[PDB]
């Protein structure tokens, strides 16, 4: 009623794209706990790295790293299928408890970050300003990463789809494809939304005799 | 320099989950244009409905519907593979131009919404207030749909994975599967994150 202990900045984890997923948003009254289920990015991925972050930017790189830990032993699976739950938990003492647990194999790793951790009152104001200063440039990163990640999904979708009808695929179609796949994956490594969508498009015109 | 034309509320399209994806964020100085590439949700999906919305909520249902249009002729494809680009364009006149174009088949539909369209100044403040009044309940919806959508992805991943090894899958494994899949999908129709993550776990 007279005071509320609250989170100064958002707390989340870095996910695919180099982006950062917020689990406890800014100015949340701390005693709170949020969990969200994630998955793997690669086929047969055995471990996930839980990179903890405090910040308001879209680049996990432009935020404060409170810690990082690995949850391994994830039994081999088709990408996007394993289930990993990341649970951010801050008690009244303002102590953060980040746990990751394979919602199947039961494995669970943890890390406890004390409240003295993070950006100080100063860094907190700078974080907030830059967030506002860069809001648009951050908006550019979002749309890029979303696309980039969708370009990823296309590269693999198509790569596997090749197998599902290998010889059914006529030379200069199947060859016209592998070439574009090689071109796109490179575009993904870059950051030109336009060109990424461009190679995505090329693959979409070449890889048609199996649409 | 003295005054600025800004969009009073965010503009976007409704997507899988019943959620709403913002293409032009709130208070953007209008002469702006943004485009984001979307795809289909189902296998062999032939058309997408571009449902235009204005609002700040997470539920496409809790926003102002500016209009809707269909972009069909999407050549059959595995879900998540067709490329559809939605482009929101608001000129100085404040007129909205929402187009969608199959980044492969070339097709493209368009809709033009005039500036008098939308929530008036009154509705704009109520929108903004409810946004804030509900901010958390909205957050509940966000985490719900992300999980729900991920449960959708599993239901299919699994269902197809069955074919990829049909006979390879011994009865009471393969039967044990077909059963829970039925369970999960029902849960997805629900809105209990705890329950959905459970039926997901079961599979």
């Amino acid at each position: 009623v007279l005071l509320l202990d609250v989170t100064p900045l958002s707390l989340g984890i870095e996910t695919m794209g180099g982006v950062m997923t917020t689990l406890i948003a800014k100015n949340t009254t701390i005693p709170t706990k949020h969990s969200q289920v994630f998955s793997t990015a690669e086929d047969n991925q055995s471990a996930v790295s839980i990179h903890v972050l405090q910040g308001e930017r879209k680049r996990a790189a432009d935020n404060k790293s409170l810690g990082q830990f690995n949850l391994d032993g994830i039994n081999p699976a088709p990408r996007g299928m394993p289930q990993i739950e990341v649970t951010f938990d801050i008690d009244a003492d303002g102590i953060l408890h980040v746990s990751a647990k394979d919602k199947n194999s039961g494995k669970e790793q943890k890390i406890t970050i004390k409240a003295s951790s993070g950006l100080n009152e100063d860094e907190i104001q700078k974080m907030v300003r830059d967030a506002e200063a860069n809001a648009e440039a951050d908006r550019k990163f979002e749309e890029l990463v979303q696309t980039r990640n969708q370009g990823d999904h296309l590269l693999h979708s198509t790569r596997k789809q090749v197998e599902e009808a290998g010889d059914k695929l006529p030379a200069d179609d199947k060859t016209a494809i592998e070439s574009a796949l090689t071109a796109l994956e490179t575009a993904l490594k870059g950051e030109d939304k336009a060109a990424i969508e461009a190679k995505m498009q090329e693959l979409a015109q070449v890889s048609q005799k199996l649409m | 320099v003295l005054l600025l034309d800004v969009t009073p509320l965010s503009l976007g399209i409704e997507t899988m989950g019943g959620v709403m994806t913002t293409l032009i964020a709130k208070n953007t100085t209008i002469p702006t244009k943004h485009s984001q590439v979307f795809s289909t949700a189902e296998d062999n999906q032939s058309a997408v409905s571009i449902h235009v919305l204005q609002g700040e909520r997470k539920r496409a249902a809790d926003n102002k519907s500016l209009g809707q249009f269909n972009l069909d002729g999407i050549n059959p494809a595995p879900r998540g593979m067709p490329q559809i680009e939605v482009t929101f364009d608001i000129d100085a006149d404040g007129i909205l131009h929402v187009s969608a174009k199959d980044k492969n088949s070339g097709k493209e539909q368009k809709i033009t919404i005039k500036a008098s369209s939308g929530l008036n100044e009154d509705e704009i403040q109520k929108m903004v207030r409810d946004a804030e009044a509900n901010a958390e309940a909205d957050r509940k919806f966000e985490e719900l749909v992300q999980t729900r959508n991920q449960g959708d992805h599993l239901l299919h991943s699994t269902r197809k994975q069955v074919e990829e090894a049909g006979d390879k899958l011994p009865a009471d494994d393969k039967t044990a599967i077909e059963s829970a899949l039925t369970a999960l999908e029902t849960a997805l129709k629900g809105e209990d994150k705890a329950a959905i993550e459970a039926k997901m776990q079961e599979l």
Binding site: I13, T15, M16, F38, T40, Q45, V48, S49, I50, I84 | -
Partner: peptide, 4 residues
Amino acid sequence: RLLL
């Protein structure tokens, strides 16, 4: 949302 995938992780590495």
